[PDB]
Design a protein around this motif. Sequence first.
Motif, short mmCIF file in Angstrom:
data_model
loop_
_atom_site.label_atom_id
_atom_site.label_comp_id
_atom_site.label_asym_id
_atom_site.label_seq_id
_atom_site.Cartn_x
_atom_site.Cartn_y
_atom_site.Cartn_z
N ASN A 62 0.78 -1.23 0.00
CA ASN A 62 0.00 0.00 0.00
C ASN A 62 0.82 1.29 0.00
OD1 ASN A 62 -2.51 -1.27 -0.14
ND2 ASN A 62 -2.65 -1.49 2.10
N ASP A 123 -0.09 -3.53 -5.42
CA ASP A 123 -0.03 -2.12 -5.01
C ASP A 123 1.15 -1.34 -5.62
OD1 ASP A 123 -2.26 -2.80 -3.43
OD2 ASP A 123 -1.12 -3.17 -1.65
N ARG A 196 -3.28 -13.24 -0.75
CA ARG A 196 -4.41 -13.47 0.12
C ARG A 196 -5.41 -14.40 -0.57
NH1 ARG A 196 -4.37 -7.11 1.45
NH2 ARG A 196 -4.40 -7.13 -0.87
CA CA Z 1 -4.46 -3.33 -1.78
#
Ligand code: CA
Length: 320
Positions: A62, A123, A196
């Motif tokens: 991020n 990201d 994830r």
């Molecule tokens: Ca993200």
Amino acid sequence: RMLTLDGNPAANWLNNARTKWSASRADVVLSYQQNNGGWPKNLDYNSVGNGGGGNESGTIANGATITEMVFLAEVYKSGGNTKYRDAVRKAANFLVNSQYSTGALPQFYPLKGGYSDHATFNDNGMAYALTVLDFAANKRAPFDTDVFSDNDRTRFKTAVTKGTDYILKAQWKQNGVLTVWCAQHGALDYQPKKARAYELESLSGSESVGVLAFLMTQPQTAEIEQAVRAGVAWFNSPRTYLEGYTYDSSLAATNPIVPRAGSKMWYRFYDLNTNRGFFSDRDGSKFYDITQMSLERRTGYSWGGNYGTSIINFAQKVGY
Ligand SMILES: [Ca+2]
Ligand SMILES: O=C(O)[C@H]1O[C@H](O[C@@H]2[C@H](O)[C@@H](O)[C@@H](O[C@@H]3[C@H](O)[C@@H](O)[C@@H](O)O[C@@H]3C(=O)O)O[C@@H]2C(=O)O)[C@H](O)[C@@H](O)[C@H]1O
């Protein structure tokens, strides 16, 4: 063999990051830097209180680390306070230390195990980290101060070269046709990897933009021009984008994928082999009808967007 930086989405990211927060927040940004030189997580330096440093793994998730270091580099340029120069130096040291022999950049470092270990384009992590190191290598603002030495720059140039080499080798061949990248690849095996549970092996409609942008900052060798051309062709192919559609995140309660004249949509995840856009969920499942997805994942993550627009317009501009 050099292309303009004007309009390059990575360059734009970096120049924006220079002034992302108020200069008055430099000290709070600084207060979160870990001892290894990386930042412990992405943060809203406009709402948080002061941190206390720490000894945790640094991360490029991020926008962490890469944003803070560009910002502090600008602050140092503007204000002259050396503690910000020192912070930037540790951030770049952090980035180069994190790098595998193959050129891959992990999401967390020191390594924590599991998917975070992989080469992480997610990201714009790896692509933008390499863009930062490249700007630093080339004395581009805000790195055109005394923040770095000649030997630092050689160190970064070596890093950028290895990262470029990783990107080129990891680029996926779809039944013999060069295409794009997964959001994460094996650091040593180059293969697409999951992250994830709802992030499966796939072409990333999202992160491939940044990868191409980064390659477009590099000298355009024959094999780099081929890779950028092939990547751009993929984004601009009717087998990739949805025609007459857009992604409207405010309609995610039921279906964010809506008919829209004069519009193209790109999926977040494309099948490696069939180039079919797909969906997942917290059970790791893979399916093709977003309405079958749990409400929490359909609203909690972006399953598509206008990803291709910026790289296609940019490729046009430069004659690709
Ligand atoms: Ca993200
Ligand atoms: O499309 C996106 O990339 C997405 O990013 C953010 O959300 C994702 C995710 O969908 C969220 O549920 C949240 O995830 C949890 C933790 O914050 C995170 O550290 C990680 O371990 O995963 C957790 C989880 O599985 O729920 O935050 C994620 C993230 O920051 O990457 C945006 O909030 C979202 O709107 C969208 O942009």
